[PDB]
Amino acid sequence: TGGVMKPHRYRPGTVALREIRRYQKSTELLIRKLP
DNA sequence: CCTTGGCGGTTTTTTCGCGGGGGTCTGCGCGTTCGTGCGTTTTTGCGGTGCTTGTGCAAAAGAGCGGCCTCGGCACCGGG
């Protein structure tokens, strides 16, 4: 009985809203330079 | 200042949007494996100096010669 309980996943949109805030706060280029 | 067609209020009618409900599927989330970008050092190209290769601008005398001229000598025209 050495198993691990999993933290499951986030709802659709939660990580979306997080990354929305993160990308709207920062200003770097989002397209890769060489392509 | 004249004129009349059209806005406007009122009354019927008619019809499209939203909500509810239901169902479906498709991006979202996460895990695993793979790629190909940024970062360094090495390689090839453009340039300059030094060295190497080409080349223009005084009579005197004899001997020999070409042109030339007089001349020799001959054949020839004209006539019978």
UniProtKB/Swiss-Prot annotation:
UniProt subcellular location: Nucleus; Chromosome
Effect upon mutating residue 30 to R: In BRYLIB1; uncertain significance
Effect in UniProt of substituting residue 24 to K: In BRYLIB1; uncertain significance; no effect on protein abundance
Positions where N6-(beta-hydroxybutyryl)lysine occurs in the chain: 25
Positions bearing Phosphoserine: 26
N6-methyllysine: residues carrying this PTM: 5-6, 25, 33
Chain positions found as N6-lactoyllysine: 25
Stated consequence of mutating residue 20 to N: In BRYLIB2; uncertain significance; decreased protein abundance
Residues found modified as N6-succinyllysine: 25
Related illness: Glioma: Gliomas are benign or malignant central nervous system neoplasms derived from glial cells. They comprise astrocytomas and glioblastoma multiforme that are derived from astrocytes, oligodendrogliomas derived from oligodendrocytes and ependymomas derived from ependymocytes.
Summary of the function given for this chain in its UniProt record: Variant histone H3 which replaces conventional H3 in a wide range of nucleosomes in active genes. Constitutes the predominant form of histone H3 in non-dividing cells and is incorporated into chromatin independently of DNA synthesis. Deposited at sites of nucleosomal displacement throughout transcribed genes, suggesting that it represents an epigenetic imprint of transcriptionally active chromatin. Nucleosomes wrap and compact DNA into chromatin, limiting DNA accessibility to the cellular machineries which require DNA as a template.
Protein name, as recorded: Histone H3.3
